[PDB]
Design a binder for this molecule. Structure first.
Ligand SMILES: Nc1ncnc2c1ncn2[C@@H]1O[C@H](COP(=O)(O)OP(=O)(O)OP(=O)(O)O)[C@@H](O)[C@H]1O
Ligand SMILES: Nc1nc2c(ncn2[C@@H]2O[C@H](COP(=O)(O)OP(=O)(O)O)[C@@H](O)[C@H]2O)c(=O)[nH]1
Ligand SMILES: [K+]
Ligand SMILES: [Mg+2]
Ligand SMILES: [Mg+2]
Ligand SMILES: [Mg+2]
Ligand SMILES: [Mg+2]
Ligand SMILES: [Mg+2]
Ligand SMILES: [Mg+2]
Lengths: 51, 101, 161, 65, 349, 201
RNA sequence: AUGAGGUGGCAAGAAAUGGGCUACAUUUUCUACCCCAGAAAAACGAUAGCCCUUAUGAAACUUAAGGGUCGAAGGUGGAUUUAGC
């Protein structure tokens, strides 16, 4: 589909910006968001809900 | 001295979930991916099951902080609709006003 | 006093304000993607990764530095540029050039006065006008104004009036 | 905060473990709330877990260390 | 209306003046390709008057001044929706038919890239798909249009329709046309053979050839057809589209190619798209490049007055107030001099 | 209604304004002077000053409209008018010189005459009693009967333009189920004639 | 212990009934466009059933989304009745 030029440019841009470099599926990509976001429990709204 | 035993149970659940969130996140990261071996994912599954029941985040219920109402709780204020109406109508909440348009 | 929104930094720079050649500019544009607005020729980098304002600002400056240096750097795979990989259309070595060359060759063959050459045919002012019109249509705004120029050039080249 | 992959010295340089740790490090780096020590703690926890489960890794043919 | 009903003799002086086309000419020349609304108007009025417009005049002048030695020149009727592009192509077609050319007329390429249920993988080439119903439908009208020239053409190869049936070198192209018409399964292959033979014989000098394709952008616009796996089918995979692209290629002489852009019936193109690159995509633009675009625009005041006079003469504008200048101005404003909108408006007055 | 009661409906008629002052009566002069001091409702998006505006056809289109699809209703109306005109032209050409004098070709005249022929004179009201019908009710009953007959399921796969054109021509010639329905209403009124006294007005 | 805690569990339909949604199509259906087109048309018609996948979740036949498979009932509906200026 995409030209190898665009493919390599996109991967180089990902390397530059610190994004995921290797190809990956949606199921495995969940880990990135899981570790980027805080756990639901650790959020102040969640663990300090009650005074 | 929480409002009721239900609110006390929810407080216990929130404390347990906050305690075990990091371990839960770590163990669930292994399970929620298609890279690691299936045997490793299965052992991770049994471990996350082995974690205590109350640590599950889905068991945290958003009860009103003042009357322990299990439903009709506005998240932004954490108050059941009844208590929120009481305070807003008496004018003790900034900005909120009776809407007319 | 804490507020998570306070950690976000935005670094804006006009690419024309940097020391960039055509190749480096195009490579940087393709690397940064939608972070660059062509209308204003402005690269905007938003940093919210680091917890702190100073950290995010330093990260944005570092991103600019690395992007600039790598854009100036040239990769081997760059040679493998599909004709569609270019943001701009180049008449040279293009389908338009090939087609007009073949058409002129066929015309002169039909005339049977085959005392011609590719460069001789393509150096004529008529080919210059046709190339200008084709570039106008492919890269500039498409409109009746450009279509008229293209029609006139093609008419003169094809010898029909 | 960002270039956390320098902490992945102990993990294999290739394979499922390396790919998974790449994903984990990218997530941690993108995370703006956790402190550097907590991110390193997550990485250390994964290291310890894989070291403990090295038997299963060897049985599944995923080179470790 | 013009006393000059000859398609070749009428000139600039007849701009905005009408031009009749006899019923015999209509039957022999346009079994297909006329706009449906104009066909209905013809059936209603028992007449086929076309207005002599500047684009048609210019294209006719170009065709008259052509030199068949050069490779076939590509002209592209162009412009907005419902401005008379198809009828200008029909005017040129009638001119060349009266001039005794072989008219390879494609009434609408858009019909070939949608709604087909008989789509089948081509037996001659599994890579491509055939459209037997459309192929036979086009072949019948093509024979009706150019029967007289059909016998004269000598085929130059042996074409096998089965392991047992074939047509031999030196045979009339009428043989292939009849085979395609009758044996529906072979209609697409017959159309391809016909295109090949016409294109080569034009260069040989056997006869002048006018290719006249409406909706040429369909040859590169995406198709809505689907495979057995519900997967989209690219335009080139259709044998008809492939052969028509080969015909559109200017690697031949002894004729001319006239194509008309048409957003109507196009697939995956916005309504307000009327520019050539926009309608043809870059692929189609390069395929047809170089070409001479001929713009067709809304009626000028004289053309508007002539069309209104034609309708009044036919008594089509039965409305009581239509003849009044107030009604004339109302029609002019509502149609903004667009022939299609004006015709649709007058349809119910 | 967002309009205050003071607002007055707009009068869209160029002739009314172009009329010379001299031809105006004192009452008309006073009305024109008064209107200069009154508020006027914004002209509705339906009716304009076009000489090709037919209020009867506009009302028929509105009645045919379904779920605010005014565009489709207008399309159906114009298609019906075109079909009527085309059928008339075909009959005109196919007819001899004598019958060409009789054969009408104006779709507006055909439509108006058909609806007039379909207008019922006497209605029935519960009090059932035969009763006079006001002109507005007569026109509405004609239009509704025509539209309902066209929408009848008895016609299979036939498009509304063709159906309505055929029914309109039949009515113009005083035939068809619409005229049959009008005759049925008249017959029921005649049958209940004896009950006419029950009406108190 | 009529209090507290934990594990597991119902929640289905003999049958009826209120409301809502989808339809019964040609002013319709599919496609393009988003309103100047081409096809369907005994098909129309399930958000129903069955299988698979995916989302969330510790846990999905249970929830949702998607895909596949199926193409069902029905053909504008009695009294009566709802809303709308
Ligand atoms: N030269 C003409 N002479 C007579 N009628 C014309 C002419 N041009 C346009 N018309 C009228 O307009 C219609 C023909 O328009 P045509 O089919 O050519 O539209 P188009 O603009 O080429 O493209 P499309 O409508 O497919 O976008 C007919 O109703 C016809 O009466
Ligand atoms: N069945 C059949 N079709 C033929 C034959 N020769 C030409 N055709 C038609 O023309 C096509 C071949 O065109 P050609 O110019 O040879 O080039 P090609 O299409 O790339 O093979 C076939 O796909 C048919 O549509 C033949 O002998 N048999
Ligand atoms: K009902
Ligand atoms: Mg919950
Ligand atoms: Mg047209
Ligand atoms: Mg108890
Ligand atoms: Mg389903
Ligand atoms: Mg799961
Ligand atoms: Mg079906």
């Amino acid at each position: 589909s995409l030209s190898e030029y665009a493919f390599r440019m996109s991967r180089l841009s990902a390397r530059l910006f610190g994004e995921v470099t290797r190809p990956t599926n949606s199921k495995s990509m969940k880990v990135v968001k899981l570790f980027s976001e805080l756990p639901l429990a650790k959020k102040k709204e969640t663990y300090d809900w009650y005074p | 001295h929480y409002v009721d035993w239900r609110m006390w149970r929810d407080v216990k659940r929130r404390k347990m979930a906050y305690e075990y969130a990091d371990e839960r996140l770590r163990i669930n990261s292994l399970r929620k991916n298609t890279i690691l071996p299936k045997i490793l994912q299965d052992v991770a599954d049994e471990e996350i099951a082995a974690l205590p029941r109350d640590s599950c985040p889905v068991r945290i219920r958003n009860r009103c902080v003042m009357t322990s109402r299990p439903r009709g709780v506005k998240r932004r204020w954490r108050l059941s609709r009844i208590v929120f109406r009481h305070l807003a109508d008496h004018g003790q909440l900034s900005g909120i006003q009776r809407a007319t348009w | 006093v804490r507020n998570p929104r306070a950690r976000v930094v935005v670094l804006r720079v006009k690419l024309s304000s940097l020391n960039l050649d055509d190749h480096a500019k195009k490579k940087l544009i393709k690397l940064v993607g939608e972070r660059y607005c062509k209308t204003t020729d402005v690269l905007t980098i938003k940093t919210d990764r680091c917890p702190l304002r100073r950290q995010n600002y330093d990260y944005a400056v570092y991103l600019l530095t690395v992007l600039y240096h790598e854009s100036w750097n040239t990769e081997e795979w760059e040679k493998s540029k599909t004709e569609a990989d270019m943001e701009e259309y180049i008449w040279e070595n293009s389908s338009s050039e090939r087609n007009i060359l073949e058409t002129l060759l066929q015309m002169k063959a039909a005339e049977k006065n085959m005392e011609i050459n590719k460069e001789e045919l393509l150096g004529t002012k008529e080919i210059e006008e046709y190339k200008k019109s084709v570039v106008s249509l492919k890269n500039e705004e498409e409109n009746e104004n450009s279509i008229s120029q293209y029609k006139e050039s093609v008419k003169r080249l094809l010898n029909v009036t | 905060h960002i270039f956390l992959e320098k902490h992945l010295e102990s993990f294999p340089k290739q394979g499922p473990i390396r790919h998974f740790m790449e994903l984990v490090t990218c997530g941690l780096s993108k995370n703006p709330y956790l402190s550097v020590k907590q991110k390193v703690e997550h990485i250390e926890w994964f290291r310890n877990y894989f070291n403990e489960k090295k038997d299963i890794l060897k049985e599944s043919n995923i080179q470790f260390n | 209306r013009t006393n000059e009903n000859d398609p070749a003799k009428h000139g600039d002086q007849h701009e905005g003046q009408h031009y009749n086309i006899s019923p015999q000419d209509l039957e022999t020349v346009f079994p297909h390709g006329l706009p449906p609304r104009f066909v209905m108007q013809v059936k209603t009025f028992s007449e086929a008057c076309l207005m002599v417009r500047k684009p048609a005049l210019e294209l006719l002048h170009y065709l008259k001044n052509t030199s068949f030695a050069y490779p076939a020149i590509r002209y592209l009727l162009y412009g907005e929706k419902g401005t008379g592009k198809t009828l200008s192509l029909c005017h040129v077609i009638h001119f060349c038919a009266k001039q005794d050319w072989l008219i390879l007329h494609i009434p609408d390429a858009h019909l070939w890239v949608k709604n087909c249920r008989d789509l089948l993988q081509s037996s001659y080439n599994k890579q491509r798909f055939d459209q037997p119903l459309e192929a036979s439908t086009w072949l019948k009208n093509f024979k009706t249009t150019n029967e007289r020239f059909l016998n004269q053409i000598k085929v130059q190869e042996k074409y096998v329709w089965n392991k047992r049936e074939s047509t031999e070198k030196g045979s009339p192209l009428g043989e292939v046309v009849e085979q395609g018409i009758t044996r529906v399964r072979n209609a697409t292959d017959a159309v391809g053979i016909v295109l090949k033979e016409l294109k080569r014989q034009s260069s040989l000098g056997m006869f002048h050839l006018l290719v006249a394709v409406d909706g040429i952008n369909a040859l590169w616009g995406r198709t809505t057809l689907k495979r057995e796996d519900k997967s989209p089918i690219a335009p080139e995979e259709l044998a008809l589209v492939h052969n028509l692209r080969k015909m559109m290629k200017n690697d031949w002489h002894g004729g001319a190619i006239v194509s008309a852009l048409s957003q109507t019936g196009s697939l995956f193109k916005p309504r307000k798209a009327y520019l050539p690159q926009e309608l043809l995509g870059k692929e189609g633009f390069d395929a047809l490049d170089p070409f001479i675009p001929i713009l067709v625009s809304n009626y000028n005041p004289k053309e508007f007055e002539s069309c209104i006079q034609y309708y009044l003469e036919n008594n089509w504008l039965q409305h009581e107030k239509a003849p009044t200048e107030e009604g004339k101005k109302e029609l002019l404003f509502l149609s903004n001099a667009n022939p299609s909108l004006l015709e649709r408006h007058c349809a119910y007055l | 209604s967002r309009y205050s009661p003071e607002f007055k409906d707009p009068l869209i008629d160029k002739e009314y304004y172009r009329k010379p002052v001299e031809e105006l009566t004192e009452e008309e002069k006073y009305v024109r002077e008064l209107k200069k001091t009154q508020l006027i409702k914004a002209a509705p998006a339906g009716k304009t000053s076009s000489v090709f505006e037919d209020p009867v056809i506009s009302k028929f289109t509105n009645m045919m409209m379904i779920g605010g699809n005014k565009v489709l209703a207008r399309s159906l109306m114009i298609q019906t008018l075109e079909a009527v005109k085309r059928k008339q032209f075909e009959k005109y050409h196919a007819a001899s010189a004598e019958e060409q004098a009789t054969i009408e070709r104006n779709p507006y005249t055909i439509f108006h005459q058909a609806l007039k022929n379909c207008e019922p004179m006497i209605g029935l009201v519960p009090i059932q009693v035969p009763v006079p019908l006001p002109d507005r009710r007569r026109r509405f009953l004609a239009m509704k009967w025509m539209i309902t007959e066209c929408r009848d399921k008895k016609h299979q796969r036939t498009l509304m333009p063709e159906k309505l054109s055929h029914k309109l021509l039949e009515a113009f010639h005083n035939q068809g189920p619409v005229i049959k329905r009008k005759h049925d209403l008249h017959k029921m009124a005649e049958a209940n004639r004896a009950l006419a006294h029950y009406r108190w007005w």
